[PDB]
Design a protein around this nucleic acid. Structure first.
Ligand SMILES: [Mg+2]
Length: 658
DNA sequence: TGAGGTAGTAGGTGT
DNA sequence: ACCTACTACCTCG
């Protein structure tokens, strides 16, 4: 039923009339970098349309300045247009007010002494120390304006790892080379390629032209935007960029959620008394607990790994093949036993084959693969020592082009490493097309499909989709080959159309209703063609955007933090807390936006949350994302890693990419 | 390549 | 303002 939660935000005082009335100042430039203008001007000023809004009186601005861009040196002329009223109810204007709030926060953060400040992040406490380093604790902050015209503070605890000696001093105590390194004078970062026994003056002079320190040896360095282009530097003016890997052999960085909540409140009070905008009042929200998904193997299960003993939801006659690259022979006995018990419990036929070929055999290897595929082999288990990334990708692509999905399982391998080999097996079986689990129950949409553009800003460079359809039949869709830039709407519609075609092949008809799930980056209009095409077909739909970041945090007011929390926010938007584990820090709720359709938010949250328990290749922990998006994510990744273009030998129920 | 999420480092649309 | 990559950590609905 109902529960109440805290968000990690805090209400502060309403804006006063002076703040609701920013100083307007239009700008003239010959012939975008309006932000640069706002910065050069100084004070609390942001872009407003093609002009500037500021909460600072003109007495402190630098109107006449010299903006120095990176392409064209432009002319800085700003002119006072009086004061302009903004309505917090109006999105654009409220966005202006919020940008002003943000600038305010940044300015007052900058005027603090004794703390490490990085943008809108402050780090006050010391949490752990070197040996040449320290870890500070603090929070990432944000400050904006509500619809009701009041300040809103966001706070989220975070640690920062800082080196306090030079690269020279760091390497002088024995430590290895960090993969990255930052200037001592500014925030710029480089990729440390190597060291150089070259002399300084035979380069040094360049830095000589610009302190209270001494320089060391030569460092080969690189700009991220050109990784193959080496450029010389001085170890004295360099500071290592330290990661967890650099401090591996020396710091507990995950917070129990009660502790995160505590630090959130305290840091909020602290910045609160630095801000002078009132007493931060934590905002509360009504949350709803969603019903628990009923996962089904042959019988009820609590996790997909249980299907290995209870039996699969839907099994068929299966042939699997073993490829060994460690020098030994035959199926390890406990693997055979587990597979046989699983298929036994499912009442299905199992055949275990052994591939007698080695990738070193070139065309003979491909031929033996083709022959295994002819004899009915659906997937291959590769027992191998840890492969180099390049070799992994080569071997996988090679098996795939002959129509054989592959599951890698690393040796040495012991029967007691049950989680590892059981997950390998679940992956193998999904790759063979088996349906290991499904949801039992009624859902409004009988087809749910997730779209992924590789995190990119558009589908114009392609993408992929995966779907769950009607029990839990899982399938993947790639776009057919053009390797060029396409019209994004047509890529999206083509992925969906192919998914509909598979559904129709299986059911003798189109679905009555589909649930379309997408990421948070591409513009919503990239889906317009697909939506209209569903409408022309009389198919109903909902489009829901699912954002992995930006959901903030959610805490219970009282009692324990539990999964399956649905938290409605502003009008078509809600938070969904899908997964949580106490040993796993604090959850990051998904932020979802209902973009099209008329299904109530509650029923959408219910289905999406339930799709989260469907992933067949994780035996013991549920994914945060609903399975179609999680799947699509992994699919685009593997398409990128293997170079796949015209897959034709692989059934769409074979989840080769998990 | 077991997998999950979270946690850290950095990134994207001169030397 | 949303996205990505890498590593570490701990644990196994
Ligand atoms: Mg896998």
């Amino acid at each position: 039923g109902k529960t109440e939660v805290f968000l990690n935000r805090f209400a502060l005082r309403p804006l006063n009339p002076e703040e609701l009335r920013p100083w307007r100042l239009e700008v003239v430039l010959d012939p975008p970098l309006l932000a640069q203008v706002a910065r050069r001007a100084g004070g609390v000023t942001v872009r407003m349309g093609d002009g500037l809004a500021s909460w600072s009186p003109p007495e402190v601005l630098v109107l006449e300045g010299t903006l120095a861009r990176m392409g064209q040196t432009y002319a800085y002329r700003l002119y006072p247009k009086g004061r302009r009223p903004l309505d917090p109810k109006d999105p654009g204007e409220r966005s202006v007010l919020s940008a002003l709030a943000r600038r305010l926060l940044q300015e007052r953060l900058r005027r603090l002494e004794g703390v490490w400040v990085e943008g809108l992040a402050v780090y006050r406490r010391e949490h752990a120390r070197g040996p040449g380093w320290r870890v500070l604790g603090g929070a990432v902050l944000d400050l904006w304006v509500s619809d009701s015209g009041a300040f809103l503070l966001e706070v989220d605890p975070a640690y920062r790892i800082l080196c306090e000696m030079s690269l020279e001093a760091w390497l002088a105590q024995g430590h290895p080379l960090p993969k990255r390194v930052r200037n001592a004078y500014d925030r710029r970062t480089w990729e440390l390629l190597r060291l150089g026994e070259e002399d300084p003056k035979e380069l040094l002079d360049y830095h000589a032209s610009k302190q209270g320190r001494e320089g060391g040896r030569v460092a080969w360095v690189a700009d991220p935007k050109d990784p193959r282009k080496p450029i010389p530097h001085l170890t004295g003016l360099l500071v290592p960029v330290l990661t967890l890997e650099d401090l591996h052999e020396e710091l507990a960085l995950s917070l129990p959620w009660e502790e995160r909540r505590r630090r959130t409140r305290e840091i909020a009070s602290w910045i609160g008394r630095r801000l002078g905008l009132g007493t931060p009042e934590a905002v509360r929200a009504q949350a709803y607990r969603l019903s628990i998904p009923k996962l089904m193997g042959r019988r009820a299960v609590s996790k997909p790994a249980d299907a290995l003993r209870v039996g699969f939801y839907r099994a068929q006659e299966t042939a699997l093949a073993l490829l060994r690259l460690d020098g030994a022979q035959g199926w390890p006995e406990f693997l055979r036993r587990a597979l046989l018990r699983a298929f036994g419990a499912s009442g299905a036929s199992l055949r275990l084959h052994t591939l007698h070929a080695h990738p070193s055999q070139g065309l003979a290897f491909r031929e033996a693969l083709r022959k295994a595929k002819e004899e009915g082999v659906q997937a291959v288990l590769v027992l191998t020592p840890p492969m180099a990334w390049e070799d992994r990708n080569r071997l996988k692509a090679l098996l795939l082009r002959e129509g054989l999905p592959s599951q890698i399982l690393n040796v040495p391998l012991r029967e007691e490493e049950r989680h590892r080999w059981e997950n390998a097996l679940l992956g193998l079986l999904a790759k063979a097309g088996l349906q290991v689990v499904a949801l039992s129950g009624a859902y409004p949409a009988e087809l749910a499909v997730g779209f992924d553009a590789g995190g990119r800003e558009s589908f114009r460079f392609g993408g992929a989709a995966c779907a769950v359809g009607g029990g839990g039949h899982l399938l993947w869709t790639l776009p057919e080959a053009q390797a060029g830039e396409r019209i994004p709407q047509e890529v999206v519609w083509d992925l969906l159309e192919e998914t509909l075609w598979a559904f129709r092949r299986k059911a003798g008809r189109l679905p009555s209703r589909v649930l379309l799930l997408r990421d948070g980056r591409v513009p919503q209009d990239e889906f317009a063609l697909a939506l209209e095409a569903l409408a022309r077909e009389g198919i109903a739909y909902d489009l829901v955007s699912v954002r992995k970041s930006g959901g903030g945090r959610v805490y219970p007011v009282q009692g324990r933090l539990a999964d399956g929390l649905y938290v409605p926010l502003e009008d078509k938007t809600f938070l969904l807390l899908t997964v949580h584990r106490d040993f796993r820090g604090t959850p990051r709720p998904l932020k979802l936006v209902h973009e099209a359709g008329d299904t109530p938010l509650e029923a959408l949250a219910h289905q999406i949350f339930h799709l989260t328990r469907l992933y067949p290749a994780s035996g013991f922990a549920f994914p945060r994302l609903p399975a179609p998006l999680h799947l699509a994510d992994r699919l685009v990744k593997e398409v990128g890693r293997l170079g796949i273009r015209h897959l034709k030998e692989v059934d769409r129920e074979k989840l080769f990419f998990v």
